[PDB]
Amino acid sequence: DADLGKSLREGYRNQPKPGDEGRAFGVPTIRTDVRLPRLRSVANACNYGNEPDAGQVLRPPRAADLGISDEAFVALRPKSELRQLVDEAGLALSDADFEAAW
Amino acid sequence: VLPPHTAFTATTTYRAETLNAEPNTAAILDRSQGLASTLVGYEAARQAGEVRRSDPRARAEDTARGIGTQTVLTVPTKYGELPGYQTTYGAATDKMARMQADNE
Amino acid sequence: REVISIHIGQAGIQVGNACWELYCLEHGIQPDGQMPDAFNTFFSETGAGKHVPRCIFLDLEPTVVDEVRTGTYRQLFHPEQLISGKEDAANNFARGHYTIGKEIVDLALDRIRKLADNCTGLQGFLVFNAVGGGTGSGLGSLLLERLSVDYGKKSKLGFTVYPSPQVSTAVVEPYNSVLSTHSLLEHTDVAVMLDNEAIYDICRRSLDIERPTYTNLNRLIAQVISSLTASLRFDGALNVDITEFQTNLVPYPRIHFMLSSYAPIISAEKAYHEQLSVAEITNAAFEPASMMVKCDPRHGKYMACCLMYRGDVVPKDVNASVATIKTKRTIQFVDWCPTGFKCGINYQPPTVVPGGDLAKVQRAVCMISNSTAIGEIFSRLDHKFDLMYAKRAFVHWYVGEGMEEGEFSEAREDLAALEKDFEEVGA
Amino acid sequence: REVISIHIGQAGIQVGNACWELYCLEHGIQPDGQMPSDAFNTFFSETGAGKHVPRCIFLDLEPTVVDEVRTGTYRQLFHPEQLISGKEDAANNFARGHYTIGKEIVDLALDRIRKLADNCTGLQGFLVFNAVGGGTGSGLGSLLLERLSVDYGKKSKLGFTVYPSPQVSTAVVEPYNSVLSTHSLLEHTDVAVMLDNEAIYDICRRSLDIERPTYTNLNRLIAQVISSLTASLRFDGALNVDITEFQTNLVPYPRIHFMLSSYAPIISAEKAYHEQLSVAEITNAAFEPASMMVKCDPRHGKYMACCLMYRGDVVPKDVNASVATIKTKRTIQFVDWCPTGFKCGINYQPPTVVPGGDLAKVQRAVCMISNSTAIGEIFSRLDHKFDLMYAKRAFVHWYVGEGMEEGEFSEAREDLAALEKDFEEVGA
Amino acid sequence: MREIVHIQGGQCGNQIGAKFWEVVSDEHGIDPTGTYHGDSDLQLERINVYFNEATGGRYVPRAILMDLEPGTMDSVRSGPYGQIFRPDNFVFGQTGAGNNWAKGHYTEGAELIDSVLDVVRKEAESCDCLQGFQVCHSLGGGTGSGMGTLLISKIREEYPDRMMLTFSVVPSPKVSDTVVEPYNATLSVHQLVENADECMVLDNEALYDICFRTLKLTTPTFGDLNHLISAVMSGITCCLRFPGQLNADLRKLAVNLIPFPRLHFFMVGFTPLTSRGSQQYRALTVPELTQQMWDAKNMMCAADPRHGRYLTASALFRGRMSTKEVDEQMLNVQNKNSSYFVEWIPNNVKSSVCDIPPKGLKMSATFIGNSTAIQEMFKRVSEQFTAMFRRKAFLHWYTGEGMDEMEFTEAESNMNDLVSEYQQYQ
Amino acid sequence: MREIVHIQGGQCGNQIGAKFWEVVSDEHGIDPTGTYHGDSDLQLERINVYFNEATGGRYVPRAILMDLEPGTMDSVRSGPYGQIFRPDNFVFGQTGAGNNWAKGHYTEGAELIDSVLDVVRKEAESCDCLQGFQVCHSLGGGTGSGMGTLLISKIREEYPDRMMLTFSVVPSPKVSDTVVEPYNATLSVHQLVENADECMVLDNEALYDICFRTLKLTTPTFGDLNHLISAVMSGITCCLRFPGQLNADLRKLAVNLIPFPRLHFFMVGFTPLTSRGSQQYRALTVPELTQQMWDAKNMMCAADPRHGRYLTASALFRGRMSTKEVDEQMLNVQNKNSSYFVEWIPNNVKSSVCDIPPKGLKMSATFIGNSTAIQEMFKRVSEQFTAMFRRKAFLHWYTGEGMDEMEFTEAESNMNDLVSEYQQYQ
Ligand SMILES: Nc1nc2c(ncn2[C@@H]2O[C@H](COP(=O)(O)OP(=O)(O)OP(=O)(O)O)[C@@H](O)[C@H]2O)c(=O)[nH]1
Ligand SMILES: Nc1nc2c(ncn2[C@@H]2O[C@H](COP(=O)(O)OP(=O)(O)OP(=O)(O)O)[C@@H](O)[C@H]2O)c(=O)[nH]1
Ligand SMILES: Nc1nc2c(ncn2[C@@H]2O[C@H](COP(=O)(O)OP(=O)(O)O)[C@@H](O)[C@H]2O)c(=O)[nH]1
Ligand SMILES: Nc1nc2c(ncn2[C@@H]2O[C@H](COP(=O)(O)OP(=O)(O)O)[C@@H](O)[C@H]2O)c(=O)[nH]1
Numbered sequence A: 001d002a003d004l005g006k007s008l009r010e011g012y013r014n015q016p017k018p019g020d021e022g023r024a025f026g027v028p029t030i031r032t033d034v035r036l037p038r039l040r041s042v043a044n045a046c047n048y049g050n051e052p053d054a055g056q057v058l059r060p061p062r063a064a065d066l067g068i069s070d071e072a073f074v075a076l077r078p079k080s081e082l083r084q085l086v087d088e089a090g091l092a093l094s095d096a097d098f099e100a101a102w
Numbered sequence B: 001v002l003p004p005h006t007a008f009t010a011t012t013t014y015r016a017e018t019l020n021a022e023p024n025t026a027a028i029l030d031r032s033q034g035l036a037s038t039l040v041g042y043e044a045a046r047q048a049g050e051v052r053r054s055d056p057r058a059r060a061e062d063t064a065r066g067i068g069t070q071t072v073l074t075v076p077t078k079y080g081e082l083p084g085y086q087t088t089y090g091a092a093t094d095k096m097a098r099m100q101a102d103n104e
Numbered sequence C: 001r002e003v004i005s006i007h008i009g010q011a012g013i014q015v016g017n018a019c020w021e022l023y024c025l026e027h028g029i030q031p032d033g034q035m036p037d038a039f040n041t042f043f044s045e046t047g048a049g050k051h052v053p054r055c056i057f058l059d060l061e062p063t064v065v066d067e068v069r070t071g072t073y074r075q076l077f078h079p080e081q082l083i084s085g086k087e088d089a090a091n092n093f094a095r096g097h098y099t100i101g102k103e104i105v106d107l108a109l110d111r112i113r114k115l116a117d118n119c120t121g122l123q124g125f126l127v128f129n130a131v132g133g134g135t136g137s138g139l140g141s142l143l144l145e146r147l148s149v150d151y152g153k154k155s156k157l158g159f160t161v162y163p164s165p166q167v168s169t170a171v172v173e174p175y176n177s178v179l180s181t182h183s184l185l186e187h188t189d190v191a192v193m194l195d196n197e198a199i200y201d202i203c204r205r206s207l208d209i210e211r212p213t214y215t216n217l218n219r220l221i222a223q224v225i226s227s228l229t230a231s232l233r234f235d236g237a238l239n240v241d242i243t244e245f246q247t248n249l250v251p252y253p254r255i256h257f258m259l260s261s262y263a264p265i266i267s268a269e270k271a272y273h274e275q276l277s278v279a280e281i282t283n284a285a286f287e288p289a290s291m292m293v294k295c296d297p298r299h300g301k302y303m304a305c306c307l308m309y310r311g312d313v314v315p316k317d318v319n320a321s322v323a324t325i326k327t328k329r330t331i332q333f334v335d336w337c338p339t340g341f342k343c344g345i346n347y348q349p350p351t352v353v354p355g356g357d358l359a360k361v362q363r364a365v366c367m368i369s370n371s372t373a374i375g376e377i378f379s380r381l382d383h384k385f386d387l388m389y390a391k392r393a394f395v396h397w398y399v400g401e402g403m404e405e406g407e408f409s410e411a412r413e414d415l416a417a418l419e420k421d422f423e424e425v426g427a
Numbered sequence D: 001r002e003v004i005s006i007h008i009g010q011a012g013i014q015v016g017n018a019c020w021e022l023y024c025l026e027h028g029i030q031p032d033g034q035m036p037s038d039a040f041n042t043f044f045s046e047t048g049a050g051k052h053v054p055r056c057i058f059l060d061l062e063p064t065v066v067d068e069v070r071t072g073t074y075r076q077l078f079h080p081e082q083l084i085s086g087k088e089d090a091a092n093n094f095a096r097g098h099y100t101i102g103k104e105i106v107d108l109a110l111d112r113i114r115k116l117a118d119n120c121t122g123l124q125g126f127l128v129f130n131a132v133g134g135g136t137g138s139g140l141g142s143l144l145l146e147r148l149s150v151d152y153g154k155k156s157k158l159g160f161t162v163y164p165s166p167q168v169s170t171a172v173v174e175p176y177n178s179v180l181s182t183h184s185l186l187e188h189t190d191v192a193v194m195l196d197n198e199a200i201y202d203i204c205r206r207s208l209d210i211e212r213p214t215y216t217n218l219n220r221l222i223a224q225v226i227s228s229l230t231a232s233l234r235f236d237g238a239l240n241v242d243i244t245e246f247q248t249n250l251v252p253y254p255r256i257h258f259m260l261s262s263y264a265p266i267i268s269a270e271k272a273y274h275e276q277l278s279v280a281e282i283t284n285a286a287f288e289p290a291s292m293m294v295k296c297d298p299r300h301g302k303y304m305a306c307c308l309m310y311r312g313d314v315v316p317k318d319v320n321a322s323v324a325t326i327k328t329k330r331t332i333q334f335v336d337w338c339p340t341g342f343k344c345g346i347n348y349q350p351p352t353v354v355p356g357g358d359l360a361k362v363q364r365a366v367c368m369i370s371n372s373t374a375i376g377e378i379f380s381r382l383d384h385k386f387d388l389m390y391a392k393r394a395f396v397h398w399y400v401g402e403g404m405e406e407g408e409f410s411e412a413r414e415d416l417a418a419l420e421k422d423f424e425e426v427g428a
Numbered sequence E, F: 001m002r003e004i005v006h007i008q009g010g011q012c013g014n015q016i017g018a019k020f021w022e023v024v025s026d027e028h029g030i031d032p033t034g035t036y037h038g039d040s041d042l043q044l045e046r047i048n049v050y051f052n053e054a055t056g057g058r059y060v061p062r063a064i065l066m067d068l069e070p071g072t073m074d075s076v077r078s079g080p081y082g083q084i085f086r087p088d089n090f091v092f093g094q095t096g097a098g099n100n101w102a103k104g105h106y107t108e109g110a111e112l113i114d115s116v117l118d119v120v121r122k123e124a125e126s127c128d129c130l131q132g133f134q135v136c137h138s139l140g141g142g143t144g145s146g147m148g149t150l151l152i153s154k155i156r157e158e159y160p161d162r163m164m165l166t167f168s169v170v171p172s173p174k175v176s177d178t179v180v181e182p183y184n185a186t187l188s189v190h191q192l193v194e195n196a197d198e199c200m201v202l203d204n205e206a207l208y209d210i211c212f213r214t215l216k217l218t219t220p221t222f223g224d225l226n227h228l229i230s231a232v233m234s235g236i237t238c239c240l241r242f243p244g245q246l247n248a249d250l251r252k253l254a255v256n257l258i259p260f261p262r263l264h265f266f267m268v269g270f271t272p273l274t275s276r277g278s279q280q281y282r283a284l285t286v287p288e289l290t291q292q293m294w295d296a297k298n299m300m301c302a303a304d305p306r307h308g309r310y311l312t313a314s315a316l317f318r319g320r321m322s323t324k325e326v327d328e329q330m331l332n333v334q335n336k337n338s339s340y341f342v343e344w345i346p347n348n349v350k351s352s353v354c355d356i357p358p359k360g361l362k363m364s365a366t367f368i369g370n371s372t373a374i375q376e377m378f379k380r381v382s383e384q385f386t387a388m389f390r391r392k393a394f395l396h397w398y399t400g401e402g403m404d405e406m407e408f409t410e411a412e413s414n415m416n417d418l419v420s421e422y423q424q425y426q
C-alpha cells in the first residue's frame, strides 16, 4: 500500500515546496530577512538586521554624539555620492589616490 | 499440472526503506501530489490523477481552485465551470481563484 | 494588541469564511497567505513572507470543515487549526453538550491555549455562533464554560445568530435557544444579537436583491465585524479598543445584549444616486428599517448607543449629528442616563470585496445599542417555547441523551427573571 | 572525549542501524567509510588513511538481522569482525539468554570491548541499546552490564532501554523478562533512559499523523534523540555539558535513575512552514504529556530534576525567559526540596535531516530529560501484571528446565516492591 | 465517515435495491464494472458512505441481498449493475417461505438469521464511523416482512445506538396482491412500532395514480415505480453525500420529525414529476417545486393528507437555490393553510438545502410528512384484520407452526392504541 | 545455522510431505531437477535449513521417507519433484502394517527402526546446529501411527534438547476410513503427550468445510487438502528462512504458546482464502486478514473455538506491514471478545511480522491457537474407545501380538486426566 511509512495527505506531507528543496522551516532569532519598517514603534522586542554590539555602543564612535547611526557607515554607497562626500569634507585628496582607495 | 511461474520480487523492509530511502520517498510522494487531502485516500483517485498528469493558464485556475477537476480525464465543460456541479464555496471564491491564477 | 477568533457551527464557520476573506482583502494578504504591523492583531507572521490567522474553526459534521480545507484557502488555514468531528449533534443541545462534548472540547482548549501562549497582548476572545442548532448551542456553551473557568478576566465577545419570530427553519430551536441563554447570560461578556429575517429585509430594501442567499448575509456580518475592529486595527482621530465597550455599554452585569446596525447599506447604482454624508448616514443608522434584528426600537428606550465612523469623518459634524439625534423626540432615552453616546472615528474607509453587492463609499457608520426591544424578543421566544413545553414534545430525545426536566424549568424561570429584570430596569 | 556503543538484541541493533546512518549523515561520511574533504573523534576512529570506523559493537544470538546488515550497503563501514553473531536465539527466555547461550559469547564480547577501550584514549563512558521485553536484550544485556561494571565500575553506563507498553504488546513472558532485567538494571547501570512503543506510535499519529508507522520511524526518532544528547560532546556550544553533568545533576539519590525523554519539534514540512517557530513554544511543547517517549501521566507526579538540551539558533536570554514562565506556571509542580530544578544547555549546530525521512530541517530543536514518579507508576503497573501470571506458576517450567529457579523470581519481585516504596517515600 | 449499510429483503426489496444501486452508481459515476469514470471529484469525496474499495478501484456496494428464492438472485445478476455486488454477500436460503409470516419468522429464520447477522456484523465492523442501516422490504409478503422484521429486531438488540431507516411498501384493499395481507402487516408493524427508528411507507396504488395522472405513462411497469422509490432514497441520503448551505443528516431529520417516540411513520413524495409532453413548457422555480410538493395527491400513500393535520414536515431541496425564497415559501404555505397544521407547534416545517441535484435535473425536492393521516390506513387494515380473525380463517396455517392467539390479540391491541393516540393528537 | 530435518510417515504423511517439498522448492526457486534457478538473492540466504548441496548446484531435500508398501514410494516418485529426493533416505520395508498399531510398533519396527535411526542420525550430525525435527503423519492409520510414534520416542531419547514439530492429522466419526481409528489414536496420543514436544492438529472434515464454504470448490481432492497443509507448514517455518521486522523462531513460539508442559496440541489456520469469483471483490489489509484469521469457519479442526476459551494465540504475518496496525488489531480483537480469552493471562496474542509473503500474494498470515476447545475432540475419540473396549471388540489382533490390557488402561487414564486438566484451566 502507498501509505506504508508516510502521510501522503496534502496538509501534512513531508515534501517541501518546489521553490526550495532545502530551507530551515522556522523563525530566525535575528529576523534579518524582513523589510525594515518605515518608522520603528515604541515597543519592539525583536531586532532587525544590523544592530550595534554592546561593546561598540559602550565605546562609541565619535559621530554617534552628532547623531549619525552606526549603520550609516556600513551602508553601501555609490561612486558619485562618495566622491561628493569627499569633496564636501576637507579630504583634499587627488584623483589617483581616490581611484586607488575606491 | 504445476502453476506456470511466479517471479520473486518482494524485498525486505531494511533493503527497501532504510537503504533506498530517497527513491522510496520520491516514488511514494510522487504517487499523490495534486490530489486533495480529503480525496487522496482512494486508489482510483490516485490512478486518475497519475493519468491526468500523464495549457498553463488552465493549470493555473486548476491549482488555484484546488478541488475542481483533480481526477477528470454527456455533460460538456464550459469555459469557467461544469453545468451539473457548482458548489457555493466555489461560487464565492471564483474571483479569488481567478486573480490568483492571473498573478501566477 | 491582538484578539483571537473561534467559529462554532456550520453557520459560524461560514460567517468566518466571509470574515477572513474580508480581512485578507483589507490587509493585502493573498489567499496563499503571503504579502507581495496592523495585521498583527489578526495574523501572526511565520517563516519568511507568510501570515497565519488567529482563528479556530470547530464543528462536528466534517462536510463544511473539509469543504473549507479543500477550497481556495487551503494555504491560509493550515490543518492543525481546523478541528473537525465525526458526527453531527443533529440539532440536539443534549447531544452537543453531553455526549459529543467531552471528546472535542479538550482538543479545542489544548489548541486555544497554545495560540494564547503565542500571542502577547491578548485583548480577548470573539466567538461566532448561532443558537438555533445543536453544535453551536451545546458545545458552544461548554466552550464558554471552560474558557470562563480557565481565564475569567479576559473579555469575550459572542456574536450570536438568534432565531427569527416567523421566518424559521428548525423545530426545536426554542429549546436550543433557551438552553443557550441559560449560560450565555452569565458567561459571555458582550453578546451581540443577529437575525436572519431582519438581514433579509435589509438586503431586499436596500440592495433590492430579490433572491438573497447566506453569502450576502455573511458578507454584511463580516463588514460589521471589520468596522467594529478597525479602531483597534488602525489609527484614527478618536480610536476605541475592546475595553470601553464593556465600560460604556454594560450598565449592569446581567444586561449585555446589543443590537447592531450599519450604514450605508447601498449598491453601486444607488451610490451613484445618493450623496452619503455623516448626517444622513447617522439618521439612516437609527430607523428600524436598518436594524440587524427584527424588533421595534421605538417600543423601547435607548440605554446607550455607540457609533463608529470609518473613512473621511471629522469630529464637528459627527457631534452635530449626535446633537440632532438627541434633540429629536421620536426616539427617547432613559432618564437615569443623561449622556448615552460613545463615538469613535477611524481614518481608513471600508474596503470592498470583488463580487460583493456593496459599493465603496467615503464613510460608513456602525451602530451598537442597548434597549428593551431585546427584552420583548426574549418574551416572544419564551411564549412559543412554553407552548411546546406544555405537551412535553421532543423532550424524550434530550432525556434519552441524559438531560432532564429540572434544568428546562431552570432555563424557563431564568428567562422569566431576565424579562422581569429588563422591565424593572427600563422604568 | 570518546564514547562507545553496544547494541544487544533486535530492537537495540535496529535503533543502532538508524543511529549510525544519522551520525554518518551528520559528520559527512559516505557509507564506504571515508571523508571527502576532529568532531567525529567521539564515534569514529580514523584508521590508517582515508577510513573512519565506528566505535560500536552489534552483538546478538540469532544471525538473521546481523548478516542482513553484513549484506547491506553498510558493509564497508563496519568490517565483519565487530558484528558478533551467535547460532541459536535466546527465544525470549531470560534464563536461556543469561545462563545457557550467554556464557559462550560474553567472553568474546568482553575481549572485543577491551581492545575498543584500549584503542580509545579519553573514554567518557558506555552506552547500551536494548529492549527488556525479549530474551537476548534482557539476559545477555544484564550479564554484559554486570561484567562491564565489575571490569570498569567507575565509568558511567548510559542504558537506553525499551520497556513494554501497558496495553500494546507482542510477547507473553515480557513481564517476566522485564522484571528480571530491572533486577540488575536498578543496581548496575548509572543512567537509564526509558522508551516505549505506543507512546511513539501516538506521537507519530498526532504530530506526524502517520496512521501506519513502521519500526523505522520510531528508530529514526530515537536516533535523533541520541544525536541531540551527544551534540554537546560532538560540537562546541554556548553552554555545553558532557555526560558527567548528567550523572551529577540528573540524579538525587544513588538508586533513583529513570529519566523520561521528549523531543520537539517533531513536525513535517508544510506544518513547520505554517507554524512560527521560537524558543518559548518549543519549551512549552517539551512539557505536555502528548510529546513524551513513554506513555505516563506526569500530572499525577511531581518533577524532581529536568534538563533541556537546545540545538541550533538559540540564545540564553529567551531560554531563561521560557524556564521562568514554566516555573511560574502552576499546572506542573516540582518537588519542594529542589528549589532549582532546571538545567539548560545550548549548542550551535541544528539537527540534520536524513533524506527520505519524515522530518523537515529546522532552525532549532529541544530534547528533554526529566525525573518524576510516573515512572514509579509504570513500574507498579508492570509489577501487577507480573504477579497475575506468577500466581498460577505459568511459563515457569521453561526457566526451571533451563536451570533457573523460584528464588530469583521472589527476590526480583520484592526488589520491585522496594523500589515502589522508595519512589513513594522520595515523592513526599 | 458516516456509514450507511443497505439490506434488501424479499422479492420486492431485492428489485427495489437493484434499481437503487443502479441509480446511485449512475449518480456517483461508477460503471457497472465498478470502476470510476465520472466527471467531478465531488463524487469521489463521499463514495465511502455506500461503497468499499476492494482492488484497484473496484468499488463494491455495502449492501446485503437476502431472500429465500433463487429466482430473485438470478434476476438481480442478469440485470445490469448486477455484477457489482460481492458474491459473498448473497446470503440466501433454499426452501422459501410462501407468504407465511410464521415460516419467515420462526422456521426459516432459525437457519437464515444467523448467517445474515454474521455477514452484517462483518460489514458493520468493516466501517469506521457507523451512521445507520437501511432496510427495503414489504409488509404483505412472508419472507420479506417477517424475516426482515426479525432481522431488524436482532439488529436493534445488537446496536441500540445506531440509525435505522425502514422503507416498507404496504398493501391496500383495491390492490390486494395476497390473501393474508392484514395477517402479515399487523404483526410487521407490531414489531416495527418499537424496533425501527422510523419507517417510511409506500404503496403501489399511489404510484399507479402518480404515473397515470402526473407522468401520463401508458404502461407503468414495476421498473418505473422502483425508479421513483430509488430517487426518493437518493434524495433522502443526498445530504451526507454532497455539501450545501444547510445540511440535515438522518438523526437531524429524525429529531426534527418525531415529536413522540411511537410516532415514527412517515409518508414521502418527490418533485418535480412532469409529463414528457409538458416538460418543455413548464418553468423551474422554488414556487414551482413547492406547488407540486404540497399537492396532496402527489403523496406516495393511500392516506390523503387533508383528511387530518400535519404534525411535522421536512423538505430536502437539491440545486442552487435561494434560502430566502425557500423559507418564505414555507412560511406562506404554513400560514395560508392554518387548519391543516398542528396548533401547539410553531413552524411545523424543517427545510434543508444541498447544492448537488440529481443528474439531468436543475432543482429537485424530497418531501417527508409525519401527519395523522396514516391513522386512516391503520384503521383500514385493522378492520380487515378483525374481520378475518373473527372466524379464525386461515389462522391454522399460522398456529400450526408456533403461533398462538395472544400474539394476534396483542397485535390488535397495539394497532388500536396507536390509532387512538393519533386520534388523540389530531 | 538453524536446521530442520523432515520425516514422512505413512501414506497421508508421504503425500503431505511431497506437496510440502513441491511448495518449498517453488518458493526457493529450485526446479525439480535439483538445480537452482531463482532470481532474487533473498532465496540463497537460508537454503541450508531444508536442503544440502551435493555437487555442481544439486540441492537435495533434508527428508526421510518411511512406510511399508511400495505403492506410496512409486506414487511419490512418479509425480513432479519426485526425483529430487534421496534414494538412501528412501528407507523402506516390505510387509505392511495392515492398519495395526501393534504391528507398526512391535513387529516391523524391530527391523526397520534401526535403519531409519541410522539414516536420520547420519543426516542429523551431517549439519552443525539442529533447531528441530519435523515429522508429518496421521493418527488413525497403522504405519504412520505406531512406527512413527516409536520413531518419535527414539529421537526424544537420543536428542533430548531439540525442537520437534509433529504435524498430525486426526480422525473423526463423521469421516471414518478405518474401524480401529480410536484404538490407534488413543495409543498414539498417549505416546505423544509424554514424548512429543508439540503437535499441529489437523483433520479432513474442517478442510472439506473450508473448500465448500470459503474456496467454493466442487472437487476438493486429497491433493488440494495436502496443498493447504503444505502452505500452513511453509507459513509456520517462514521466519527461519526469511528476515522480518519481528523475528519468531520455533523455540520462542513454543515458549510463548505453552504455559504448561502437557498442553502442546495446537489448532492452526491460514489466511487469506478467497474464491476465484470473490477474489476481485475483496480488499487486502491487516484488518481484512484479521477478521478471517479469528473466524471460526476458517479453522482446520473440528472443534468450535467459541465453545471454550483461548489460553494463548499466535499470528504469523508475511508482507510489508504496519507493526502498529498488527498490535492494535490484536489488542482490539482481544478486548472485544474478552470472555473467550483466559483471564489470568494478559496479552494472550503473540504476533510476528516477516517481510517475505508467499509468491504471487501481497500479504498472508498463519494462525496458531492453544485453546481449550480440543477437549471436545478428545472426549469425542475417548467415548468411541471406551464403547469398543467395553467388550474388547477388535482387541485380539493386539493381544496376540504382545499388547496387554494395561496399556489401554494407561492410555485411557491419560486421556481422562488431560481433558480434566483442560476443564480445570477453562
Ligand atoms: N447568518 C447565517 N445563518 C446561518 C447560516 N447557515 C446556517 N445558519 C443558521 O444556523 C441555524 C442552525 O444551525 P446549523 O446551521 O444547523 O449549525 P449548528 O448550529 O452547528 O447545528 P447542527 O446542524 O447540529 O450542526 C439556522 O437556524 C440558520 O439560521 C449562514 O450561512 N448564515
Ligand atoms: N522501538 C522498537 N522496538 C522494537 C523493535 N523491534 C522489536 N522491538 C521490541 O523488542 C521487544 C522484544 O525484543 P526483540 O526486539 O523482539 O528481540 P530480543 O530482545 O533480542 O528477544 P529475542 O527476539 O527473543 O532474541 C518487543 O516487545 C518489541 O516491542 C524496533 O524495531 N523498534
Ligand atoms: N414497487 C414494487 N413492489 C413490488 C414489486 N414486486 C412485488 N412488489 C410488492 O410486494 C408485495 C408482495 O410481497 P411479496 O413479493 O409476497 O414479498 P415476499 O415474501 O418477499 O415474497 C405486493 O403487494 C407488491 O405490490 C416491484 O418490483 N416493485
Ligand atoms: N489430507 C490427506 N489425508 C489423507 C491422505 N491419504 C490418507 N489420508 C488420511 O489418513 C488416514 C488413514 O491413514 P492410513 O492411510 O491408514 O495410513 P497408513 O497406515 O500408512 O496406511 C485417513 O483417515 C485419511 O483421512 C491424503 O492424501 N491427504
Ligand SMILES: [Mg+2]
Binding pocket: C009, C010, C011, C061, C088, C133, C135
Ligand atoms: Mg450543523
Ligand SMILES: [Mg+2]
Binding pocket: D009, D010, D062, D089, D134, D135, D136
Ligand atoms: Mg531477538
